[PDB]
Design a protein around this nucleic acid. Structure first.
Ligand code: MN
Ligand code: MN
Ligand code: MN
Ligand code: MN
Ligand code: MN
Ligand code: MN
Ligand code: MN
Ligand code: MN
Ligand code: MN
Ligand code: NA
Length: 326
DNA sequence: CGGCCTACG
DNA sequence: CGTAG
DNA sequence: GCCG
């Protein structure tokens, strides 16, 4: 009917229940801030079910039988339908705790546990953090230094410019190596928090050692403001007319044997991939990550040449990236 | 009861 | 701990 | 919070 796992149904980028899903996602985020990943996941799964529906929900009746809707999520929807507002959601969004945890966790290098410690210490603003720089890692220092730019949506023109300089550096580092745009932009998003790239080479093994060489070539062109291997979480100095802006870029290398798995994982959405890995293990007895798909009884890895091969093997109807917006 | 994705830096 | 989708 |  409505399948229970998000990887079993198409979720388009544009859907029909934004008001309801956004309210449930507030509660999910707040559950995360209080350290309950289980409640976070339920609220995100409920919100995702609404994104997959073909029409607006207008009456409580339409939730009957939907997976991940129980008493709490149904009451939130009921109050939004009846009153236009959910008291619990409004109390969360106006709370000092929620607003400060959101502010701090949005910083690159800061998660819930760090944000919660700072909150318990009385810190409330970005200026509070900057005044106490000894309590910051180098990663957090970079996230705070570039926070304004990193809060500006990344546009497609930015993606295209970044893809060009990444392709130039990759080609200088290793002839024949390829760059694939992944992440939300591959799912059709028009804006993003960052740009994700996946790099490989058609000859297994030639990509060994590639990422440090790419990073050196980008840094020699003055393109790198921060970096810290096979995954590089960077901040680039992106030229703009007369100036520049900082942009988060993730660069990932995989051998071609792993490419379909890495492409699938890095294309998301986050919830889609968590649900796909859960489905794989719990329903099919196979272990999925961005490196492979492992049968733990035969002790063998599935050889995939495409994302479609992975969906088949898991017994799932193929979904293109633009239907993975769970 | 107890799981909730599964990696790398 | 942080990062990722 | 929901569900296997
Ligand atoms: Mn539609
Ligand atoms: Mn409740
Ligand atoms: Mn009422
Ligand atoms: Mn991204
Ligand atoms: Mn690896
Ligand atoms: Mn990214
Ligand atoms: Mn329990
Ligand atoms: Mn993400
Ligand atoms: Mn509980
Ligand atoms: Na963060």
């Amino acid at each position: 009917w409505m399948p229970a796992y998000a990887c079993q149904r198409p979720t388009p980028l544009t859907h029909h229940n934004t008001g309801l899903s956004e309210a449930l996602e507030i509660l999910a985020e707040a559950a995360g801030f209080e350290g309950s990943e289980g409640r976070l996941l339920t609220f995100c799964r409920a919100a995702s079910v609404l994104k997959a529906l073909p029409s607006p929900v207008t009456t409580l009746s339409q939730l009957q039988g939907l997976p991940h809707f129980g008493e709490h999520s149904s009451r939130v929807v009921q109050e939004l339908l009846e009153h236009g507002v959910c008291e619990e959601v409004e109390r969360v969004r106006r709370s000092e705790r929620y607003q400060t945890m959101k502010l701090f966790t949005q910083i690159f290098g800061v998660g819930v546990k760090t944000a919660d410690r700072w909150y318990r210490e009385g810190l409330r603003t970005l200026d509070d953090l900057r005044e106490q720089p000894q309590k910051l890692t180098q990663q957090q220092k970079a996230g705070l230094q570039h926070h304004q730019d990193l809060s500006t949506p990344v546009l497609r023109s930015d993606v295209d410019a970044l893809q060009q300089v990444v392709e130039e550096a990759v080609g200088q580092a290793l002839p024949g190596a390829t760059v694939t745009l992944t992440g939300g932009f591959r799912r059709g998003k028009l804006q993003g928090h960052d740009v994700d790239f996946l790099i490989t080479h058609p000859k297994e093994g030639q990509e060994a050692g590639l990422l440090p060489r790419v990073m050196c070539r980008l840094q020699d062109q003055g393109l790198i403001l921060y970096h810290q291997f096979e995954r590089s979480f960077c901040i680039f100095r992106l030229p703009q007319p007369g100036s520049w802006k900082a942009v988060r870029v993730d660069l990932v290398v995989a051998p071609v044997s792993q490419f379909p798995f890495a492409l699938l994982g890095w294309t998301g959405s986050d919830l889609f991939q968590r649900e796909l890995r859960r489905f794989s293990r719990k329903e099919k007895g196979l272990w999925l990550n961005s490196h492979g798909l492992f049968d733990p009884e035969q002790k063998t890895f599935f050889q995939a040449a495409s994302e479609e091969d992975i969906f088949r093997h898991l017994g799932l109807e193929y979904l293109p990236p633009e239907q993975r917006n769970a």
